[PDB]
Design an enzyme around this catalytic site. Sequence first.
Site, mmCIF file in Angstrom:
data_model
loop_
_atom_site.group_PDB
_atom_site.id
_atom_site.type_symbol
_atom_site.label_atom_id
_atom_site.label_comp_id
_atom_site.label_asym_id
_atom_site.label_seq_id
_atom_site.Cartn_x
_atom_site.Cartn_y
_atom_site.Cartn_z
ATOM 1 C CG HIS A 132 34.421 43.775 104.820
ATOM 2 N ND1 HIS A 132 34.884 42.484 104.766
ATOM 3 C CD2 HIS A 132 33.546 43.967 103.874
ATOM 4 C CE1 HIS A 132 34.125 41.836 104.124
ATOM 5 N NE2 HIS A 132 33.261 42.718 103.512
HETATM 6 C C1 LIG Z 1 33.982 45.007 98.665
HETATM 7 C C2 LIG Z 1 32.724 44.220 98.127
HETATM 8 C C3 LIG Z 1 31.811 43.925 99.005
HETATM 9 C C4 LIG Z 1 31.629 44.024 100.329
HETATM 10 C C5 LIG Z 1 30.536 43.377 101.122
HETATM 11 O O1 LIG Z 1 29.470 43.053 100.559
HETATM 12 N N1 LIG Z 1 30.676 43.397 102.391
HETATM 13 O O2 LIG Z 1 30.060 42.278 103.136
HETATM 14 C C6 LIG Z 1 32.699 43.819 96.823
HETATM 15 C C7 LIG Z 1 33.767 44.384 95.621
HETATM 16 C C8 LIG Z 1 33.163 44.956 94.652
HETATM 17 C C9 LIG Z 1 34.661 42.938 95.322
HETATM 18 O O3 LIG Z 1 33.981 42.187 94.742
HETATM 19 C C10 LIG Z 1 36.048 43.106 95.225
HETATM 20 C C11 LIG Z 1 36.758 42.115 94.792
HETATM 21 C C12 LIG Z 1 38.004 41.659 94.615
HETATM 22 C C13 LIG Z 1 38.921 42.885 95.044
HETATM 23 N N2 LIG Z 1 40.249 42.976 95.000
HETATM 24 C C14 LIG Z 1 40.988 41.687 94.421
HETATM 25 C C15 LIG Z 1 40.714 44.059 95.278
HETATM 26 C C16 LIG Z 1 38.373 44.080 95.592
HETATM 27 C C17 LIG Z 1 36.924 44.181 95.620
HETATM 28 ZN ZN LIG Z 2 28.937 41.275 102.015
#
Ligand SMILES: CC(/C=C/C(=O)NO)=C\[C@H](C)C(=O)c1ccc(N(C)C)cc1
Ligand SMILES: [Zn+2]
Length: 360
Positions: free
Chosen positions: A134
């Site tokens: 990411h």
């Molecule tokens: C970053 C991540 C997984 C990363 C991964 O596993 N990389 O491959 C999960 C997070 C907890 C998540 O689900 C989330 C959802 C919406 C959001 N907004 C709407 C701001 C911000 C975060």
């Molecule tokens: Zn992931």
Amino acid sequence: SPITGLVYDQRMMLHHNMWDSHHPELPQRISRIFSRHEELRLLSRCHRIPARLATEEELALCHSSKHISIIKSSEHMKPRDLNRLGDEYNSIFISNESYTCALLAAGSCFNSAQAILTGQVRNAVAIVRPPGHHAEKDTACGFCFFNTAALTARYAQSITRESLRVLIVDWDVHHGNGTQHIFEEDDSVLYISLHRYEDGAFFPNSEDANYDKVGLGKGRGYNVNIPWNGGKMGDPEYMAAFHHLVMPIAREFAPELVLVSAGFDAARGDPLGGFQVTPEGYAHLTHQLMSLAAGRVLIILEGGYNLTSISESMSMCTSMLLGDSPPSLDHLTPLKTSATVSINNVLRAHAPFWSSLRVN
Ligand SMILES: CC(/C=C/C(=O)NO)=C\[C@H](C)C(=O)c1ccc(N(C)C)cc1
Ligand SMILES: [Zn+2]
Ligand SMILES: [K+]
Ligand SMILES: [K+]
């Protein structure tokens, strides 16, 4: 003889969340995976590749010096400044060891790509953290600081030739927005991602992950998004996506090196993915990719948060790289209709670019 390389360094466990000791991107993700490779006697079968720090010059293959400088500065920050800095990004936590760990994850992968490309090993597995897909050229995102897989593809070209063909298969349940963007205008790096999309409602929440984002300029056709809509997907859907899309496109591309952004968050038991891919499913996908690039495959850990699921899933991928018998999996199970719709959408969007593809 074919040798499998493995890279792991316990120092990558130092990156931690000081405000939530149970944050899912745990230091224990890599140590539990490493211990499972020891228990299954897979580690002893591998050539141990030493970890190293990526240099700032190597990080500059994909990232801006501004972004590198800001992450580098966190090494000397008090907790209140680490909290403030982390809050400037979408879903990032930082500790004083974060920068070092991100350098170790990338450096480990460069040494593994170098080992494969110089013929020291046939293929390799990198048990690294924090993840990378990411991360963008200019920013950290979603637990990622630097784009380890993207940097590894550029590093590989830097030590061979600019036109080295790299296929990046991203099977983490999330879209590798950073990886897509870094190579969007590039025909030397084919990016294929499979990911839960839910009409843009699943992290990283952007229409950039949709099937119609095929690449730009000379890179048109070299970006393949396979977005899932409609809840839980598993082995049948992933095998069908590989059969109809990933493998025909990859074969037509003829990569010289295959990097896998191997998140294990599409695994059964992962609360951040909600999917049901089995360790045998991951083993099948790894064995299919081994038929490409003369077997030159490097598996890079991305996400995956159920400690038991990831340890079992990644160990099964290493077992395949080592030459163990693949699981007996077939294409007889009917797919969920929404997965059929998804695969047909990618086939339609990519039919102009890849002559070997079937219509539906
Ligand atoms: C970053 C991540 C997984 C990363 C991964 O596993 N990389 O491959 C999960 C997070 C907890 C998540 O689900 C989330 C959802 C919406 C959001 N907004 C709407 C701001 C911000 C975060
Ligand atoms: Zn992931
Ligand atoms: K993905
Ligand atoms: K591309």
